[PDB]
Design an enzyme around this catalytic site. Sequence first.
Site, PDB file in Angstrom:
ATOM      1  N   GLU A 162     -16.983  18.354  -1.126  1.00 21.07           N
ATOM      2  CA  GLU A 162     -17.700  18.133   0.059  1.00 21.07           C
ATOM      3  C   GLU A 162     -19.348  18.524   0.103  1.00 21.07           C
ATOM      4  OE1 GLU A 162     -16.304  16.471   2.306  1.00 21.07           O
ATOM      5  OE2 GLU A 162     -14.311  17.039   2.845  1.00 21.07           O
TER       6      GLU A 162
HETATM    7  N1  LIG Z   1      -8.321  16.931  -2.340  1.00 18.68           N
HETATM    8  C1  LIG Z   1      -9.699  16.696  -1.937  1.00 18.68           C
HETATM    9  N2  LIG Z   1     -10.564  16.552  -2.541  1.00 18.68           N
HETATM   10  C2  LIG Z   1     -11.611  16.070  -2.008  1.00 18.68           C
HETATM   11  N3  LIG Z   1     -12.081  15.812  -0.889  1.00 18.68           N
HETATM   12  C3  LIG Z   1     -10.999  16.068   0.064  1.00 18.68           C
HETATM   13  N4  LIG Z   1     -10.924  16.019   1.303  1.00 18.68           N
HETATM   14  C4  LIG Z   1      -9.651  15.905   1.643  1.00 18.68           C
HETATM   15  N5  LIG Z   1      -8.854  16.285   0.748  1.00 18.68           N
HETATM   16  C5  LIG Z   1      -9.700  16.205  -0.350  1.00 18.68           C
END
Ligand SMILES: Nc1ncnc2[nH]cnc12
Length: 247
Positions: A162
């Site tokens: 994120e």
């Molecule tokens: N496994 C994951 N990796 C990266 N962003 C995500 N958002 C939700 N699950 C995720």
Amino acid sequence: RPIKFSTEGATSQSYKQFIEALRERLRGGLIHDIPVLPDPTTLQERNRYITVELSNSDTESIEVGIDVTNAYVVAYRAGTQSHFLRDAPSSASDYLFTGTDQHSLPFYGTYGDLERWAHQSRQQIPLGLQALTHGISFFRSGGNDNEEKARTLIVIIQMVAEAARFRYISNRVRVSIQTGTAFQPDAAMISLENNWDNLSRGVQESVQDTFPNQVTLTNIRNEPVIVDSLSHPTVAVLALMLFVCNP
Ligand SMILES: Nc1ncnc2[nH]cnc12
């Protein structure tokens, strides 16, 4: 050749340099001047998965495998043993951690399933250098507690993936490291995480700078902000987009 981040003596600058290196490896191009991930349909599978190394010291480290088509964490590795999310793409295990014993985790990599298994929502789980340090040690120890496995992945996903996606999030983590103060993701951060695809699609399908479908986000003051155009100031928060379409 993993992209490395160490928690030992970590600084604002060292975390920033880590995220910048990750962003530069993930970038597949620019659309409307905003970096976008590669189109999965024209990507060679040998170029699809990359590794990040997260270390607490020279002798305590783990690796995490990332799908460049969506910046998803799909697996992690501690020593000779790796663990793949239940919804990891089939090809992930052909390219990541191939000299390990590869195990399948019992949960999907979605926030819904991770939060279910963690018995905590993202809003409740602390982020910051100590949380990441604690998670690295947990994965390296090999403890079987699936609740803590899910919580640890919630931490890593947000501090790595994120953060790569959103300038707001990388900066917030950078501040946490700079100040030594943990944090819980605010409503703005949560809304960004929940709307990455929608924002990517708005930008890339935009007609005369205007979104075909509007996107509702929440602001730092818990207020909902409507985003419908390329010129919306909140669009500058996108560091990497999911590929949706060529404009
Ligand atoms: N496994 C994951 N990796 C990266 N962003 C995500 N958002 C939700 N699950 C995720």
